[PDB]
């Protein structure tokens, strides 16, 4: 199966998918994030961050408090499974992670931790 997806985050706080499926036969999986907006990352920065459903808002909350200098992620946050960098207008970033870090049956989420964004910028990730 394929083991990559391309996702965009825009100037109206939206990702271009609501749900990511990872094929259970993948060993690694790569997420190619890009920002087709025009706004700087200072006001419209996006990352794509993975965690369990339960852990998402703790990551978001602690992340908000951590500043642009830390990509709006609390340092050494063990709840984060994998993530891109935080990017602004016209940038792109890709991450490849071990799919062994995910498990069938488990409800994962992807989201952006930039202050305020998660309200809209989130979706499910499922190993299937
Ligand atoms: Cu964002």
């Amino acid at each position: 199966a394929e083991c990559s997806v391309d996702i965009q985050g825009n100037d109206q706080m939206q990702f271009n998918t609501n749900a990511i499926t990872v094929d259970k036969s993948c060993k690694q999986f790569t997420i190619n994030l890009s920002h087709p907006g025009n706004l700087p990352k200072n006001v419209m920065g996006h990352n794509l961050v993975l965690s369990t459903a339960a852990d998402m808002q703790g990551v978001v909350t602690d992340g908000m408090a951590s500043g642009l200098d830390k990509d709006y992620l609390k340092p050494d946050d063990s709840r984060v499974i994998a993530h891109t960098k935080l990017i602004g207008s016209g940038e792109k970033d890709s991450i490849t992670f071990d799919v062994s870090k995910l498990k069938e049956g488990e409800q994962f989420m992807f989201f952006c931790t930039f202050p305020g964004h998660s309200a809209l910028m989130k979706g499910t990730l499922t190993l299937k």
Side-chain angles (χ1 to χ4, degrees), residues 9-10 13-15 33 35 41 43-48 86-87 111-118 121:
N10 71 17
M13 293 173 36
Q14 301 154 354
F15 285 123
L33 178 74
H35 193 317
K41 71 168 175 188
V43 298
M44 193 56 58
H46 303 312
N47 48 12
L48 194 148
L86 190 77
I87 63 176
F111 48 95
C112 176
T113 65
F114 187 98
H117 287 195
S118 74
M121 300 189 70

Side-chain angles (χ1 to χ4, degrees), residues 22-81:
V22 174
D23 195 278
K24 58 177 188 183
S25 63
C26 291
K27 173 55 180 172
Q28 297 202 303
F29 188 82
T30 117
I31 300 176
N32 301 307
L33 178 74
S34 68
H35 193 317
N38 300 286
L39 292 175
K41 71 168 175 188
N42 311 81
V43 298
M44 193 56 58
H46 303 312
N47 48 12
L48 194 148
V49 182
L50 301 185
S51 71
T52 65
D55 281 346
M56 164 184 169
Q57 76 111 338
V59 171
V60 170
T61 297
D62 292 335
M64 200 203 56
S66 296
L68 182 63
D69 23 271
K70 308 193 179 314
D71 274 7
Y72 293 105
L73 287 173
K74 185 184 69 161
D76 308 315
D77 196 329
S78 66
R79 293 166 302 192
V80 175
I81 298 169

Side-chain angles (χ1 to χ4, degrees), residues 3-24:
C3 298
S4 79
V5 64
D6 294 350
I7 294 170
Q8 297 174 5
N10 71 17
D11 283 344
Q12 46 208 350
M13 293 173 36
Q14 301 154 354
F15 285 123
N16 68 341
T17 180
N18 58 307
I20 299 173
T21 69
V22 174
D23 195 278
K24 58 177 188 183

